[PDB]
């Protein structure tokens, strides 16, 4: 067995290769206390990690060590990996290879320090660093398609044909569920309700995860919510009081299809997918159009597969069929795909091994993992 | 490939599937030991008659059989000295891996290019209809594998000729 | 490597050490080379003085083709009495050594270049005589065929430079022709050698490499070498002929061309060995795909979950 | 038989030493490393080896080491390493020369078979001898090749970059039932020096810097709990080492208790492995006591050291004193039961001028002997029996 | 040394093929006469074009024994010659009408013809092998594996 | 049964003597992956050949090893013969004597090397190298006629009378269906469709096959198409985009009649045929005009028989019959003619046999073949 540790920017998703689904899913958060620690003894800790922080958050400054899929704070990222292996999986990491992941078009130094900490702190016996939108394509049961992965921090497209990636046609967009959370705070502020702190940012994430949905036709949905009760509904806070919301429920997800709302100049996710298909060689485009693959938690909004199929069918030539593949387990497909990969018998030849790291130094990942 | 070997490989497939009716058998000459009786030959009543199947003076199979073991040995096409070297070496890689192709011998019987030993334990713990499909799919493809290697040898003979000759 | 070095690497590295060294140690080093050649490098009188010496079975022939004047031109003051058991010897003094790091570099190169400087003498005799015939032919183009006909039989060089070879060469007013009477005695190299020599001739007949010498091949000898000693047609030799035209040994090219034509048979000998190293890496690729044709005979069972060292494990 | 100087190749896990028999040093000593890539196919021509393949890590080649724990274990890489050794560096013709190759005592028969088929079918060499490497290293001890200077009885302790093994030899015969082997040597102590620099988080811990800190700074102390205590009392023992990075800039490394705790891997191999628990002085006593009784005075009297990883400052004296302690304690138990005295046994551990490459100098000195062409596998025997001609162990007792 | 001296061959006499298969009752000259009368009927059946009645009559008796190679080879020469002279579209009409005893005499001798390609054309024997096994089933090879070794 | 291959400069046609049409017809192509394989488990393969390379082409750089009827990359031609033998016909090359086919006025080195490969690499028992135009008279059932063969790589005339060829009157022209694809790619740019890659070349080859024709008078057809949409057609790319095509529909094949379009100085196929007949002896011209035989795929354009009859009738003397026999099977008529020749009772003595080759070397071919 080998660990598969998809340290995403919003959730760590971890477990064992060939296991059905990730067994350690928790916030990619380190919390530190912000108040007068008056009661002596009491089992107090200098910092808290994951669900241990999320449940204590009313006294903590929660901060994610990872932003837009790039590690910003290594002293806390080691704290998350240590929590993953010793507290959440309860293994010794020196006994198991780890398949890690990262998004494409990351800094070189991210990939180096992430191999160095696995070999020099966690003492791991072998490791590998897969591209997240390649893994999501194993989890679809395919060898050609265009994975749209979108998580908490990054959205990216990787077009693949016959198992060859077309790396010139990879699109990264630094917009995903954390920007939709920050935008939901900016529009909730307009109805009556103020959310400000790093802990209140989790309450509005827990709104976004169950009140929001994607409108199939935003400009007509906007007129319908401005003229009826049916689109409005309510959520009950930790403080027992009720929050009622309406056109905020679909204006939030719409930022993915209209990044101009949060001040970005870019294509939306629909036109970013088409700009990746139209960068590919002309003979493969039909087999990409019939195999768009949704992945990552930001693709979980009710109606996003219907909307994505509508917007791509308007951009694509009407002569040919579009399919969006969106399984119900697309919430974890990058982990699911790493759990396939780390169990394929040729894969056991591809690991960076401890001995090979010791001899080659941390630059070995650049001449073995892609 | 297939269409020229089709008469021959239907004779080999049919002989080899009629030959692979193996059983557990404790040896009569030694106590508390089983042995592959085709390979030892010390008690004759549990050997079956050795059958040859054959397309040509070059291309032949010898099939030897016993109550718990079958030995199968083949000569493949070697029509010039480049195929003699390419075959003789290719089979030494293929028998050098015998610990992981469980049915291979590590040495051929005398005057054969490669040889297989399908023992009772293999027909209990491996799919015996996929064993003959591997023997047959090896005999179809090995002529295409070796002929392709004599193309790559010509390709390098050109690589070194052009690279030497183009720096005058 | 794709093509052989012209110099002996060991003598280049060794002299590059001692020419840099603040404190030389003593040495006694016999050093083999291709074509049955052998060097001896030693410090016989002092650690300060290096004697380099060369042994080569055909050196008595090379002295007939003017070798000593070429070696006295190149090595000058460093030439020494031949060491007993060796054909030629040079004594270089590490305290009397040239001044600059680029003088040291080109002297360490020049001394390591000894095999191709001793075996160059018949080529310089042919190139410099073709320069005379090129002027005589330019004086009378109707006499020129008869000057070529007599130089083809009177000015011919033959060097029995190893026992399974002969290099034969002669000047004519527009060329130097050189013929390798070449044989591979090791039978697995004779089998590949047919492919390597055939594809070498067939390569010259393509648009990409027309700028090269006209190569030709046979197995009987070219008409103008059919009565040279040691050339025999029946003994399974092959007769690779290069025609070097005036454009293949123009003054900028002569030294590279001499260096590069001597090494001919040695590149084929090296590439025959280095083709077995290729065929093996291509064979063990097809073995690794026949593995898949057997793997479909193993019944599907999950082998139990284990730690990296193969010890048993208890999770999932 | 050909008369040409036999070619000698000690392919170590760390360094290959190459040359011709009868020379006074190896023609080359360079790392056993190959640099490889990681419309005609040429990725098997583009490789480099030795000192010229360290220069290639920045040019985007992957370096790999085809010998690990003293055994060849990548045969594609080792075949390319030999072709390039023979045709670039040694610049020889294999069909003219006998070759002496070396391997550890406990190598698998499969590796001698693969070595023989590569030498006879790829290179076509005239003949081959595959020498057990520590059996040669005794012959580097002699003051000269001449018969009166020989001392054909002695234990030989060999420790390179990848294996240490102790071979007893007596009256010129290798006592094969008594060989001891431990795959812990110069590289495993480098990974330990590297592991310590890395736990202190020093500016550089690349393999080349731990390899240099071993041979610059480390030594074998008497006892590590007193040496840790000395590093508190005696603060000039924390050396400062200046290392230059892969990318061409300065650094400074403080070197600490790895100055003694790293060579201690030989005298307490529990530090390195769970599997090889027996320390080198007791591993030597197990050799000499397993050996037949009449040779034991001779085997202790002459314990030859060999191979680069025996060169640590004070290594010979630690081995001599800890072995003398094991030996005189055992003799004094026997004096106790008898009440009579004994003459004891002298234990000498012999460090000597050729200790850095003793296996090569041993191979060179043996291969000069007129009999050597008769001990080789000649290619005539290869054409008769095939590569199985090399499969039999010369050293151990064989059934059949 | 002693380890290599075999004793089993001189203290534990093993079975012989004539213990496992009953010995032939007909004498060598009695079968050599019986074959030499049939081969002319088979040679004649080719010369009159009725080669299929040649096989039916040739296959009515079979020579066997370690004493008779010089006439087992003549019987095999006539049999391979008769197989090389039957039209491939007539084979399925012959094979479906053979008894299981005659079939087990055909396929037994085609595996003797396939053992000597430098004297017999394999291409027509492999064609008979496909047709005889496809029509009469795989057990007809198993009766050859199990058959007498001096056939 | 003998084999027969027409190793075409753009399609291989291969089969057995006595069949009515080729057993296998496939592009004379070899392709290598241009991208990096990211999937494991996929059957990654270092080169594809024939129809598999044509099918996977969106990730391959495609090479033709034959240029103008001359083999120029031998390694990728040996791959194609190994594909014809072991994969397409799936018969071992040692079992069957084999008729190869070649264009007139080729390099001697091309036919020697093609002999040396067949006897020393494919070990064939016998072979023969017939001239492609001489086989077109066998297919057409003639013994007197002038062939006009035109393939992918080359166009040539061989005039023949009572079976005697006139080798002084052979005209050969390195302009055929490849140079028409290269020119159609160029003029397609003038309407705005940029095709650039070795795979887009195979889309523009298909446009040329599906839509082009030869217009009976070019200045009249130009003045027609300049006024009107009636001559236009539309083709759906494998991308589902539709291109629409104008006077470049017939300005492409006119290159055969006006080589100055592609800059080269030569007579068009009409004048080069008339010059071949005017080089012939005066008594035979009167029959060469009556038995003018077309072959090869570049002679398949609609209206090319009527264009060719109109132009030869304008050149040749008006007092006698011009009669062009372009049969409906003419796409394969070199192979069909080869399958007749190799089937003749009188041809079985004319093969170069292996025992007869190795006593003479490959220079035997020039003293048994034409
Ligand atoms: N049901 C849902 N509806 C909308 N957003 C969701 C839903 N489920 C998860 N998300 C969002 O997905 C993000 C986490 O997705 P994930 O794929 O695990 O990201 P990452 O890999 O970067 O950690 C968070 O922003 C989370 O709120
Ligand atoms: N002075 C020294 N002190 C300690 N180790 C040394 C010294 N000099 C060299 N070494 C070590 O010796 C080893 C190489 O020895 P060698 O005999 O060549 O081993 P091998 O044969 O296995 O390659 C390396 O670990 C090297 O760092
Ligand atoms: N129906 C057609 N209409 C026009 N061009 C055609 C047609 N069919 C094939 N071609 C062209 O003819 C060429 C193939 O003809 P072919 O006779 O097989 O040539 P070759 O023998 O040299 O390979 C290609 O350029 C192809 O595009
Ligand atoms: F980091 Be998550 F994939 F956005
Ligand atoms: F490989 Be070294 F001899 F330890
Ligand atoms: F062979 Be194609 F006719 F050029
Ligand atoms: Mg993610
Ligand atoms: Mg060593
Ligand atoms: Mg053609």
Residues C122 and C139 in one domain: no
Collapse the DSSP code of F102 into the 3-class scheme (helix H, G, I; strand E, B; otherwise coil) and give the result. strand
Residues C256 and C171 in one domain: yes
CA–CA min distance D35, chain F (Å): 22
Contact A153, F33 (CB under 8 A): no
Out of C29, C34, C270, closest to residue D27 by CB: C29
Cα D150 to Cα D139: distance, rounded to the nearest angstrom: 8
DSSP element (H, E) containing A99: strand A98-102
Range of the domain at C20: 1-129
CATH 3.30.420.40 assigned to domain D134-183+278-358? The reply is yes
Across the interface, whether the CB atoms of C1 and D91 are under 8 A apart is answered: no
User: What does the DSSP assignment read for D212-245?
Assistant: HHHHHH-B--S-HHHHHHHHHH-GGGS-EE--B-
Specify the DSSP class assigned to residue D123. Answer: I
Q: Which residues of D touch C31 (CB under 8 A)?
A: 20, 27
Structural fold of domain D2-133+359-393: Nucleotidyltransferase; domain 5 (3.30.420)
Task: Give domain limits for chain D.
Answer: 2-133+359-393, 134-183+278-358, 184-277
Across the interface, whether the CB atoms of B152 and D121 are under 8 A apart is answered: no
Residue with tokens 């959730």: A11
CATH code of residue C202: 3.30.1460.20
Give alpha helix (H) positions in A24-73: 51-54
Specify the DSSP class assigned to residue E13. Answer: P
Give alpha helix (H) positions in chain D: 75-84, 109-117, 133-137, 186-199, 207-217, 224-233, 258-261, 280-290, 296-301, 315-338, 358-367, 372-375, 379-385
Q: Whose CA is nearest to atom 2 of ligand 4?
A: A151
Collapse the DSSP code of F27 into the 3-class scheme (helix H, G, I; strand E, B; otherwise coil) and give the result. strand
CB proximity list for C25: less than 8 A, separation 6 or greater: C47
Contacting D residues, span 19-58, partner chain A, CB-CB under 8 Å: 38, 57
CB proximity list for D159: less than 8 A, separation 6 or greater: D185, D186, D266, D306, D307, D308, D309, D310
Cα A167 to Cα C158: distance, rounded to the nearest angstrom: 60
The domain F181-269 is placed in CATH, from the list 3.90.640.10, 2.60.120.10, 3.40.50.10780, 3.40.50.280, at: 3.90.640.10
Instruction: Kindly give the distance from the C-alpha atom of residue F314 to the centroid of ligand 6, in angstroms, as a whole number.
Output: 28
Calculate the CA dihedral of residues B47, B53, B59, B61 and round it to 10 degrees: -20
CA–CA min distance F81, chain D (Å): 18
Q: Which residues of E84-122 are buried (b: 16+ CB within 10 A; e: fewer)?
A: bbbeeeebeebbeebeeebbbbbbbbbbbbbbebeebeb
Cα C9 to Cα C11: distance, rounded to the nearest angstrom: 6
Cα F264 to Cα D121: distance, rounded to the nearest angstrom: 55
Q: Closest Cα to residue D191, out of D282, D272, D90?
A: D272
Cα A231 to Cα A222: distance, rounded to the nearest angstrom: 10
Q: Hey, is the C-beta of B156 within 8 angstroms of any chain D C-beta?
A: yes
Cα D63 to Cα D82: distance, rounded to the nearest angstrom: 16
Mutate to test the interface with A, among D33, D57, D188 (most CBs of A within 10 A): D57
> Rounded to the nearest 5°, which phi and psi values hold at D157?
-95, 115
CB proximity list for A42: less than 8 A, separation 6 or greater: none
Q: Which domains does chain B have, with CATH numbers?
A: 3-168 (3.30.1460.20)
Q: Any residues with Cβ below 6 Å from ligand 3, and which?
A: F 6, 8-11, 151-153, 177, 205, 208-209, 296-298, 300-301, 331
Across the interface, whether the CB atoms of A19 and C309 are under 8 A apart is answered: no
Cα B27 to Cα C39: distance, rounded to the nearest angstrom: 65
> Rounded to the nearest 5°, which phi and psi values hold at A353?
-95, 155
Cα F215 to Cα F302: distance, rounded to the nearest angstrom: 8
In Å, what is the CA distance from D310 to each residue of D62, D318, D374?
A: 30, 11, 33
Q: Is F138 exposed, middle or buried (0-12, 13-18, 19+ CB in 10 A)?
A: buried
> Rounded to the nearest 5°, which phi and psi values hold at A166?
-110, 85
The domain D184-277 is placed in CATH, from the list 3.90.640.10, 3.40.50.300, 1.10.3720.10, 3.20.20.70, at: 3.90.640.10
Do chain A and chain B touch with ≥3 beta carbon pairs under 8 Å? Answer: no
In Å, what is the CA distance from D258 to each residue of D184, E25, F102?
A: 17, 91, 76
Domain tally for chain C?
A: 2
User: What does the DSSP assignment read for chain B?
Assistant: --TTTHHHHHHHHHHHHHH------B-SSSTT-B--HHHH--SGGGEEEEEEEESSSSSEEEEEEETTEEEEEEE----SHHHHHHHHHHHHHHHHTTTTSTTB-SSPPTT-SEEEEEEHHHHHHS-HHHHHHHHHHHHHHHHHHHHHHHHHHHHHHHHHHHHHHTT-
Cα C207 to Cα C196: distance, rounded to the nearest angstrom: 20
Q: Tell me the Ramachandran region of residue C112: left when phi exceeds 0, alpha when psi lies from -120 to 50, beta otherwise.
A: alpha
Residues C196 and C227 in one domain: yes
Across the interface, whether the CB atoms of D45 and C30 are under 8 A apart is answered: no
Breaks in chain A, after residue numbers (C to N greater than 2.5 Å): none
Cα D71 to Cα D67: distance, rounded to the nearest angstrom: 5
DSSP element (H, E) containing D19: strand D15-20
Q: Closest Cα to residue F73, out of F63, F65, F61, F81?
A: F65
Contact B143, F86 (CB under 8 A): yes
Longest pairwise C-alpha distance within chain A: 73
Tokens of C104: 């040291």
Domains A27-67 and A134-180+270-332 share a fold: no
Residues C6 and C140 in one domain: no
Cα D319 to Cα D305: distance, rounded to the nearest angstrom: 10
Q: Hey, is the C-beta of B144 within 8 angstroms of any chain C C-beta?
A: no
Across the interface, whether the CB atoms of D45 and C274 are under 8 A apart is answered: yes
Specify the DSSP class assigned to residue A344. Answer: S
DSSP element (H, E) containing A184: helix A177-191
Residues C165 and C104 in one domain: no
Distance of CA A203 to the CA centre of its chain: 19
Collapse the DSSP code of E142 into the 3-class scheme (helix H, G, I; strand E, B; otherwise coil) and give the result. helix
Contacting A residues, span 286-325, partner chain F, CB-CB under 8 Å: 286, 289, 316-320
> Which atom of ligand 2 approaches the CA of D29 most closely?
18
Residues C151 and C297 in one domain: yes
Q: What angle in degrees, to the nearest 10, is found between the helix axes of C254-262 and C264-295?
A: 60
Cα D62 to Cα A364: distance, rounded to the nearest angstrom: 8
Site to probe by mutation for ligand 4, drawn from A26, A28, A110, A152 as the one with most ligand atoms within 8 Å of Cβ, is A152
Q: Closest Cα to residue F9, out of F29, F23, F24?
A: F29
Contact A315, A271 (CB under 8 A): yes
Q: Pairing state of beta strands D164-170 and D154-159? A: antiparallel
The answer to whether position C56 is within a domain reads: yes
A33: β partners:
A60
Q: Closest Cα to residue A343, out of C312, C303, F44?
A: C303
Domains D2-133+359-393 and D134-183+278-358 share a fold: yes
Q: How many residues does chain C have?
A: 316
Q: Pairing state of beta strands A324-325 and A292-295? A: parallel
Contact D19, D85 (CB under 8 A): no
CB proximity list for D315: less than 8 A, separation 6 or greater: D220, D263, D266, D305, D351
Tokens of A369: 């993992």
Calculate the CA dihedral of residues A140, A145, A146, A151 and round it to 10 degrees: 10
Collapse the DSSP code of A34 into the 3-class scheme (helix H, G, I; strand E, B; otherwise coil) and give the result. coil
Q: Could you tell me which chain C residue has the CA closest to the CA of B139?
A: C290
Across the interface, whether the CB atoms of B18 and E122 are under 8 A apart is answered: no
Residues C244 and C106 in one domain: no
Out of F85, F87, F94, closest to residue B79 by CB: F94
Cα C243 to Cα C127: distance, rounded to the nearest angstrom: 13
Tokens of C255: 């030294």
E85: β partners:
none
Contact B20, B128 (CB under 8 A): yes
Architecture of the domain made up of A27-67: Roll (2.30)
E-strand ranges in chain F read 3-7, 11-16, 24-27, 30-33, 36-37, 48-49, 60-63, 66-67, 70-71, 98-102, 126-131, 145-150, 155-161, 164-165, 171-173, 233-236, 242-245, 292-295, 324-325, 352-353
User: What does the DSSP assignment read for D315-334?
Assistant: HHHHHHHHHHHHHHHHHHHH
Tokens of D349: 């551990």
User: What does the DSSP assignment read for F198-244?
Assistant: TTHHHHHHHHHHHH----SSHHHHHHHHTT-STT-EEEE-TTSPEEE
Contact F216, F210 (CB under 8 A): no
Domain-ending residue, one of C129, C148, C167: C129
Q: Closest Cα to residue A162, out of F62, F33, F202?
A: F33
Q: Hey, is the C-beta of A93 within 8 angstroms of any chain C C-beta?
A: no
Which method was it determined by? cryo-EM
Structural fold of domain A1-26+68-133+333-366: Nucleotidyltransferase; domain 5 (3.30.420)
A243 half-sphere exposure, CB direction, 13 A CA radius: 23
Architecture of the domain made up of A134-180+270-332: 2-Layer Sandwich (3.30)
Cα F262 to Cα F251: distance, rounded to the nearest angstrom: 11
Contacting F residues, span 53-72, partner chain C, CB-CB under 8 Å: 72
C40: β partners:
C30, C53
Print the SS3 string covering chain C: CCCCCCCCHHHHHHHHHHHHCCCCCCCEEEEECHHHCEEEEECCCCCCEEEEEEECCCHHHHHHCCHHHHHHHHHHHHEECCCCCCCEEEEEECCCCCCCHHHHHHHHHHHHCHHHHHCCHHHHHHHHHHHHHHHHHHHCCCCHHHHHHHHHHHCCEEECCCCCCCEEEEEECCEEEEEEEECCCCHHHHHHHHHHHHHHHHHCCCHHHCCCCEEECCCCCCHHHCCCCCCCCCCCCEEEEEEEEHHHCCCCCHHHHHHHHHCHHHHHHHHHHHHHHHHHHHHHHHHHHHHHHHHCCCCCCCCCCECCCCCECCCC
Resolution of the experimentally solved model in angstroms = 3.2
Task: Give domain limits for chain F.
Answer: 1-26+68-133+333-366, 27-67, 134-180+270-332, 181-269
Residues C11 and C120 in one domain: yes
Distance of CA D40 to the CA centre of its chain: 40
Q: Any residues with Cβ below 6 Å from ligand 6, and which?
A: F 8-9, 69, 132, 151-154, 296
D305: β partners:
D157
Cα B48 to Cα B46: distance, rounded to the nearest angstrom: 7
Residues C80 and C148 in one domain: no
Across the interface, whether the CB atoms of B11 and E129 are under 8 A apart is answered: yes
Q: Is C18 exposed, middle or buried (0-12, 13-18, 19+ CB in 10 A)?
A: buried
Cα C105 to Cα B164: distance, rounded to the nearest angstrom: 27
Q: Is F50 exposed, middle or buried (0-12, 13-18, 19+ CB in 10 A)?
A: buried
Tokens of B9: 């490989």
Distance of CA A295 to the CA centre of its chain: 8
- List all chains that touch chain B, counting a touch as 3 or more CB pairs closer than 8 Å: C, D, E, F
Q: What is the CA radius of gyration of chain E?
A: 18
Other beta carbons within 10 Å of A317: 14
Cα D210 to Cα D49: distance, rounded to the nearest angstrom: 21
DSSP element (H, E) containing A285: helix A285-289
Q: Which domains does chain E have, with CATH numbers?
A: 31-148 (1.25.40.190)
């Amino acid at each position: 067995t080998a660990l598969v540790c998809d340290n995403g920017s919003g959730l760590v998703k971890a477990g064992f290769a060939g296991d059905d689904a990730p067994r350690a899913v928790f916030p990619s958060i380190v919390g530190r206390p912000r108040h007068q620690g008056v009661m002596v003894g009491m089992g107090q800790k200098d910092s808290y990690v994951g669900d241990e922080a999320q449940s204590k958050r009313g006294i903590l400054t929660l901060k994610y060590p990872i932003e837009h899929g790039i590690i910003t704070n290594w002293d806390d990222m080691e704290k998350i990996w240590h929590h993953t292996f010793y507290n959440e999986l309860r293994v010794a990491p020196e006994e198991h290879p780890t398949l890690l992941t990262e998004a494409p078009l990351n800094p070189k130094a991210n990939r180096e320090k992430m191999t160095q900490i696995m070999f020099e702190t966690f003492n791991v016996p072998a490791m590998y660093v897969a591209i997240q939108a390649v893994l999501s394509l194993y989890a679809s049961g395919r060898t050609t398609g265009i994975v749209l992965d979108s998580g908490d921090g990054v959205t990216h497209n990787v077009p693949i044909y016959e198992g060859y990636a077309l790396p010139h046609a990879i699109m990264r967009l630094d917009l995903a569920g954390r920007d939709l959370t920050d935008y939901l705070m900016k529009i909730l502020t307009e109805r009556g309700y103020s959310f400000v702190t790093t802990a209140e940012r989790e309450i509005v994430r827990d709104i976004k995860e169950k009140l929001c949905y994607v409108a199939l036709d935003f400009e007509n949905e906007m007129a319908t919510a401005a003229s009826s009760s049916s689109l409005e509904k309510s959520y009950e806070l930790p403080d027992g009081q009720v929050i009622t919301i309406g056109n905020e429920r679909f204006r939030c997800p719409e930022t993915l299809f209209q990044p101009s709302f949060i001040g970005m100049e870019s294509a939306g996710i629909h036109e970013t997918t088409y700009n990746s298909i139209m960068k590919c060689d002309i003979d493969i485009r039909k087999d990409l159009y019939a195999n768009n693959v949704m992945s990552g938690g930001t693709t979980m909004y009710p109606g996003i597969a219907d909307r994505m199929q509508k917007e791509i069918t308007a951009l694509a030539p009407s002569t040919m069929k579009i399919k969006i593949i969106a399984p119900p387990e697309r919430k974890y497909s990058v982990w699911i795909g790493g759990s396939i990969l780390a169990s394929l018998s040729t894969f056991q030849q591809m690991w960076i091994t401890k001995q090979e790291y010791d001899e080659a130094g941390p630059s070995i990942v650049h001449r073995k993992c892609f | 490939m297939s269409n020229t070997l089709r008469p021959y490989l239907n004779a080999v497939r049919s002989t080899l599937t009629a030959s692979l009716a193996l059983e557990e058998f404790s040896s009569e000459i030694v106590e508390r030991q089983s042995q592959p009786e085709v390979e030892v030959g010390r008690s004759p009543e549990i050997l079956l008659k050795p059958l040859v199947v054959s397309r040509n003076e070059q291309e032949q199979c010898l099939i030897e059989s016993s109550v718990n073991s079958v030995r199968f040995s083949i000569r493949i096409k070697q029509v010039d000295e480049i195929e003699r070297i390419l075959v003789r070496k290719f089979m030494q890689f293929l028998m050098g891996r015998a610990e992981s192709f469980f049915i291979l011998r590590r040495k051929p019987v005398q005057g054969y290019d490669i040889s297989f030993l399908i023992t009772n334990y293999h027909t209990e713990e491996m799919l015996k209809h996929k064993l003959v499909d591997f023997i047959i799919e090896f005999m179809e493809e090995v002529d295409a594998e070796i002929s392709e290697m004599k193309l790559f040898l010509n390709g390098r003979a050109r690589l070194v000729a052009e690279t030497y000759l183009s720096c005058f | 490597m794709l093509s052989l070095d012209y110099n002996n690497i060991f003598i280049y590295e060794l002299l590059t050490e001692r020419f840099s060294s603040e404190n030389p140690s003593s040495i006694d080093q016999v050093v083999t080379d291709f074509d049955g050649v052998t060097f001896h490098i030693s410090t016989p009188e002092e650690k300060t003085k290096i004697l380099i010496s060369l042994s080569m079975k055909c050196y008595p022939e090379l002295v007939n083709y003017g070798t000593l004047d070429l070696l006295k031109q190149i090595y000058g003051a460093y030439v020494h009495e031949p060491e007993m058991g060796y054909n030629f010897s040079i004594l270089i003094d590490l305290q009397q050594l040239p001044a600059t790091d680029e003088e040291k570099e080109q002297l360490a190169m020049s001394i390591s270049m000894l095999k191709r400087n001793v075996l160059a003498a018949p080529f310089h005799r042919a190139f410099t005589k073709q320069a005379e015939l090129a002027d005589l032919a330019r004086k009378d183009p109707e006499n020129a065929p008869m000057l070529d006909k007599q130089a083809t039989s009177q000015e011919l060089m033959a060097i029995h430079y190893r026992d399974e070879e002969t290099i034969v060469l002669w000047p004519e007013h527009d060329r130097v022709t050189v013929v390798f009477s070449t044989k591979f005695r090791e039978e697995t190299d004779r089998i590949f050698g047919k492919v390597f020599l055939q594809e070498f001739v067939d390569a010259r007949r393509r648009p990409a490499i027309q700028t090269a010498p006209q190569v030709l091949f046979s197995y009987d000898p070219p008409l103008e070498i059919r009565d040279i000693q040691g050339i025999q047609k029946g003994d399974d030799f092959g007769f690779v002929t290069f025609v070097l035209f005036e454009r293949h040994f123009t003054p900028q090219n002569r030294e590279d061309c001499i260096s590069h034509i001597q090494v001919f048979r040695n590149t084929l000998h090296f590439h025959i060995k280095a083709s077995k190293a290729y065929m093996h890496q291509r064979m063990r690729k097809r073995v690794a795909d026949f593995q898949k044709v057997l793997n479909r005979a193993k019944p599907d069972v999950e082998l139990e979950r284990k730690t990296a060292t193969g010890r048993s494990f208890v999770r999932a | 038989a050909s008369f040409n100087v036999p070619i000698i190749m000690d392919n170590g896990t760390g360094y290959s030493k190459l040359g011709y028999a009868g020379n006074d040093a190896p023609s080359y000593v360079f790392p056993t490393v190959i640099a490889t890539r990681s419309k005609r196919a040429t990725e098997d021509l583009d490789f480099f080896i030795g000192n010229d393949a360290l220069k290639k890590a920045s040019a985007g080649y992957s370096l790999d080491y085809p010998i690990r724990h003293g055994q060849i274990e990548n045969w594609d890489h080792m075949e390319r390493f030999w072709q390039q050794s023979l045709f670039k560096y040694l610049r020889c013709e294999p069909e003219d020369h006998y070759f002496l190759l070396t391997e550890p005592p406990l190598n698998p028969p499969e590796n001698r078979e693969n070595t023989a088929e590569i030498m006879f079918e790829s290179f076509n060499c005239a003949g081959l001898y595959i020498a057990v490497q520590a059996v040669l290293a005794l012959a580097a001890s002699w003051t000269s090749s001449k018969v009166t200077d020989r001392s054909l009885t002695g234990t030989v302790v060999d420790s390179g970059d990848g294996v240490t093994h102790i071979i007893p030899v007596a009256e010129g015969y290798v006592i094969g039932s008594s060989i001891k082997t431990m795959p812990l040597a110069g590289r495993d102590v480098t990974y330990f020096v590297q592991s310590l620099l890395r736990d202190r988080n020093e500016p550089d811990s690349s393999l080349k810097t731990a390899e240099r800190i071993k041979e610059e700074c480390c030594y074998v102390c008497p006892d590590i709990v007193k040496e840790f205590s000395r590093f508190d009392r005696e603060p000039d023992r924390y050396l400062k080492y200046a290392s230059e990075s892969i990318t061409g800039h300065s650094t400074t490394i403080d070197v600490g208790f790895e100055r003694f705790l790293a060579p201690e891997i030989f005298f307490n191999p529990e530090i390195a492995s769970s599997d090889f628990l027996t320390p080198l002085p007791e591993l030597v006593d197990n050799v000499v006591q397993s050996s037949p009784i009449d040779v034991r005075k001779g085997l202790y009297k002459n314990i030859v050291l060999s191979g680069g990883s025996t060169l640590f400052k004070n290594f010979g004296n630690r081995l001599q004193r800890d072995l003398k302690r094991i030996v005189d304690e055992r003799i004094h138990r026997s004096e106790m039961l008898s009440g009579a005295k004994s003459g004891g046994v002298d234990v000498n551990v012999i460090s000597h001028k050729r200790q850095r490459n003793a296996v090569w100098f041993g191979g060179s000195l043996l291969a000069q002997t007129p009999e050597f062409g008769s001990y080789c596998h000649t290619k005539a025997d290869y054409e008769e029996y095939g590569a199985s001609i090399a499969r039999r162990y010369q050293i151990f007792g064989n059934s059949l | 040394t002693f380890r290599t001296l075999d004793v089993d061959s001189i203290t534990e006499p093993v079975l012989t093929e004539q213990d496992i298969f009953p010995i032939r009752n007909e004498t060598a000259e009695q079968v050599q006469a019986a074959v030499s009368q049939l081969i002319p009927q088979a040679r004649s059946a080719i010369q009159t074009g009725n080669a299929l009645q040649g096989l039916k009559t040739l296959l009515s008796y079979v020579p066997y024994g370690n004493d008779v190679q010089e006439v087992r080879t003549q019987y095999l020469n006539a049999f391979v010659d008769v197989l090389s002279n039957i039209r491939a579209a007539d084979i399925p009409a012959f094979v479906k009408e053979c008894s299981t005893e005659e079939i087990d005499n055909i396929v037994n001798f085609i595996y003797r013809g396939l053992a000597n390609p430098q004297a017999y054309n394999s291409s027509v024997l492999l064609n008979w092998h496909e047709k005889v096994v496809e029509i009469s089933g795989i057990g007809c090879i198993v009766r050859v594996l199990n058959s007498r070794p001096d056939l």
